[PDB]
């Protein structure tokens, strides 16, 4: 959950390497995308689109075991100065495509760093940020230019709780090397099913492995599989992903002059060629 | 007034120089692709002007390189334009070169009378690529520092002198200040000299043998 | 019309040049005003104008302060270094990498010594060259792209 | 750090160039000579 | 972010011919 | 795209215009 990034990594969701801390608990990797315009003018509302696709007609394991669907969520890192557009500066057309999203700032102040989710995946395969570009003209310390944008997006339950304990949307190795004896499956009048496996043989040993209700079983009975071995199966169909992009907080004048100069240049080119032609005609009289 | 021409003509023979020019001719086999050289040159002159420009504000030190760049981008008048042109023109110089190499090759213009022009051109290309790589690291940002931190180890595979070479380019065992110093010296002093000597050769030969023949 | 002055094949001096493959600037359109003074500036301003436009529309960024302790993920050299970077990473033997790289300019140096076997300019009249060229140009772009994929999905380019 | 616009200009221009070059190699591999070679 | 690439590729390629032809046309209309 | 395309065409055409315009005006006044 985006807000767990917030609790576990207070100061920022992005490590010096660019990783983004969501990768710490959500260990699968599915693809993720951000689309903004190539350029925006100062002080202008624009649309930043996060994409977080997954096979919609697909289900994941629930915490107790069921088989519900998954939610999506992202952290979007806009450049300094940028922020979510004022409710009132958002045109109807766009308000409608944004939905009931709670853009939530990583920490007080950091309004350009946005957390969002969990939101139901069936509807929010793409999430639309109404963002309002800053104004170099009134904020002396925001400058025109190209800036990075960072995104981390996730769908599906993660693998590790902030407490630090494993979840159930992953696999469970084997406690130690040896042979398998019995596999029981308790069900505490509260704590749902929890198949229990036992090892042993060779150098003593009598350890046990208790595995939550949700993952499969791809183990049989009476086999000697060493310690740390895939005896669970991988339940997880979720995953987390990153994308980066850039946007140019562009100044109209820079463009307007650039145009004027391009026009001067073409004009000047024309004049040279027209000239060449004059010379060609003049040279023609020197042929004879 | 008093004909400046005659003044110069008496001493230097300004005229023999005009005549060498107005007696060259461009053969009909010569199409727009025979501009890639000049265009590559033109991208270099743009690099020279803007690169010089930046040597007035950029500071080749691990403590100030990044801020100097930031300063050139945010605070210097048209600095953003000067740095941006230096980036694009770097990219186009290399590209236009490669196109030029295509034209030379699919025109057999590197043959007998002219293998020296082609060899010198290959050196140009190695010099040109060295600019790109040294310059890439002057911002001393994350991208650039890491790129340097890699290429710089490559030489170590070479058998007897692979570590010495590496050491010479990086000013010691690891990347660091020494490296930025050396890359700066390279990018703003060594390479512009080397590239000028070899362009000088490339052009001189070219002027000596004229363009290649029609195909 | 244009402007044309045919080779003076009556001049021994021109002929000796042609013989050593080399008098082609004595005939054609006159290089001075016609080109030098009128189309060269056009090409120069054009070259400059595109670069300026690109620089305004898509200016340079400032990335993040170098960190010795933190290796980027998303670290590629510029495009013209793709192939070499490809070659360099996807070859388990470092020395062989170096040599293959060094072979790119050493190679291009031999080119005029190898293809000196004849004197054909026109690539049609030299199908073997034109082919080894095209082949190489292909392989080149091939590894260039490969550099942008992950190591494994690299050669295949994810297709086979 | 990659760069889509450039990467694209690169290929467009590479192919358009390789192309027009062969086109020119060809246009002359047919109506060639004249002037005296 | 990669729709920029093909956009640039097509146009950089394409606009050459537009320029080329545009050039030729000028030639016709002048009388070369 | 559509909006670019329009401007593009109008921009080029506009200049193409001035080109042609200038030839003749320039031609049919004995400068060419």
């Amino acid at each position: 959950y985006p807000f767990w990034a917030q609790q576990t990594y207070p100061p920022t969701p992005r490590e010096p390497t660019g990783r983004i801390v969501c990768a710490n608990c959500h260990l699968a990797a599915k693809p993720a995308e951000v689309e903004v315009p190539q350029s925006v003018l100062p002080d202008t509302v624009f649309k930043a689109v996060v994409k977080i696709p997954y096979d919609t007609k697909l289900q994941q394991v629930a915490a107790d075991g069921s088989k519900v669907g998954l939610n999506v969520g992202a952290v979007l890192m806009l450049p300094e100065g940028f922020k979510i557009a004022p409710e009132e500066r958002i045109p109807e057309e766009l308000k409608k495509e944004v939905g009931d999203v709670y853009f939530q700032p990583y920490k007080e102040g950091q309004d350009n760093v946005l957390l969002v989710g969990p939101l139901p995946g069936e509807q929010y395969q793409e999430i639309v940020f109404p963002v309002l570009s800053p104004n170099p003209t009134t904020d002396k310390n925001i400058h025109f230019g190209k800036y990075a944008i960072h995104l981390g997006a996730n769908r599906g339950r993660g693998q590790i709780y902030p407490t630090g304990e494993k979840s159930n949307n992953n696999v469970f190795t084997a406690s130690a090397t040896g042979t398998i004896t019995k596999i029981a499956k308790e069900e505490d009048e509260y704590g749902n099913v929890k198949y229990q496996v036992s090892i042993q043989t060779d150098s003593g040993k009598t350890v046990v492995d208790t595995i939550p209700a949700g993952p499969e079983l791809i183990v049989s009975e009476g086999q000697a599989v060493k310690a740390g071995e895939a005896l669970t199966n991988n339940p997880n169909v979720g995953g987390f992903g990153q994308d980066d992009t850039e946007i140019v907080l562009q100044d109209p004048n820079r463009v307007k002059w650039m145009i004027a100069f391009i026009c001067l240049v073409m004009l000047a080119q024309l004049m040279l060629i027209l000239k060449k032609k004059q010379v060609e005609k003049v040279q023609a009289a020197e042929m004879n | 007034m008093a004909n400046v021409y005659d003044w110069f003509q008496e001493r230097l023979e300004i005229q023999a120089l005009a005549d060498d020019v107005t007696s060259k001719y461009v053969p009909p086999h010569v199409n727009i692709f025979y501009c890639l050289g000049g265009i590559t040159l033109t991208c270099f002159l743009i690099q020279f002007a803007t690169g010089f420009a930046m040597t007035f504000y950029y500071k080749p030190t691990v403590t100030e390189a990044y801020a100097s760049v930031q300063y050139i981008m945010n605070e210097v008048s048209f600095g953003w334009l000067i740095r941006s042109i230096h980036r694009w023109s770097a990219s186009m110089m290399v590209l236009m070169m490669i196109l030029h190499v295509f034209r030379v090759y699919l025109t057999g213009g590197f043959k007998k009378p002219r293998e020296l022009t082609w060899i010198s051109g290959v050196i140009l290309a190695v010099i040109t690529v060295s600019f790109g790589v040294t310059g890439y690291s002057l911002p001393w940002d994350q991208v650039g520092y890491w790129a340097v931190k890699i290429v710089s180890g490559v030489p170590e595979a070479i058998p007897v002198v692979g570590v010495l070479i590496s050491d010479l380019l990086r000013g010691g065992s690891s990347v660091g200040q020494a490296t930025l110093t050396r890359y700066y010296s390279a990018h703003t002093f060594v390479l512009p000299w080397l590239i000028a000597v070899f362009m000088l050769l490339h052009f001189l030969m070219i002027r000596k043998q004229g363009i290649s023949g029609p195909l | 019309m244009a402007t044309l002055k045919k080779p003076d094949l009556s001049d021994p001096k021109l002929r000796a040049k042609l013989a050593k493959g080399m008098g082609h600037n004595y005939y054609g359109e006159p290089a001075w005003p016609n080109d030098l003074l009128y189309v060269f500036p056009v090409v120069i301003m054009g070259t400059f104008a595109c670069i300026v436009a690109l620089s305004v529309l898509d200016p340079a960024m400032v990335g993040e302060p170098a960190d010795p302790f933190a290796t980027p993920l998303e670290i590629l050299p510029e495009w013209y270094l793709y192939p070499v970077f490809q070659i360099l990473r996807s070859v388990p033997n470092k020395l062989l990498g170096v040599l293959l790289m060094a072979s790119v300019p050493l190679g291009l140096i031999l080119v005029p010594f190898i293809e000196n076997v004849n004197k054909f300019q026109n690539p049609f009249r030299r199908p073997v060259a034109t082919t080894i060229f095209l082949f190489g140009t292909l392989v080149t772009i091939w590894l260039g792209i490969g550099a942008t994929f992950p190591l494994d999905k690299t050669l295949t380019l994810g297709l086979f | 750090m990659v760069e889509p616009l450039l990467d694209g200009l690169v290929l467009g221009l590479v192919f358009a160039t390789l192309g027009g070059l062969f086109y020119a190699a060809y246009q002359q591999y047919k109506r060639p000579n004249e002037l005296g070679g | 972010m990669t729709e920029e690439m093909l956009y640039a590729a097509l146009l950089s390629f394409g606009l050459i011919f537009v320029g080329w032809g545009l050039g030729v046309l000028l030639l016709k209309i002048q009388g070369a | 795209m559509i909006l670019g395309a329009v401007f593009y065409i109008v921009f080029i055409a506009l200049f193409f215009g001035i080109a042609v315009g200038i030839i003749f005006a320039i031609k049919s006044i004995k400068l060419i």
């Binding site: 350029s39 080119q269 | - | 189309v39 054009g46 104008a49 436009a53 529309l57 | - | 320029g19 | 670019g4």
Partner: peptide, 29 residues
């Protein structure tokens, strides 16, 4: 937000007009 479009277009136009202007100028390819 469409002075932006005129901007890129300016790029395409000079690149085009430039080629056009060369070809025309040297009757060329």
């Amino acid at each position: 937000m469409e002075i932006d479009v005129l901007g890129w277009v300016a790029l395409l136009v000079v690149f085009t007009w430039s080629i056009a202007m060369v070809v025309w100028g040297r009757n060329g390819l």
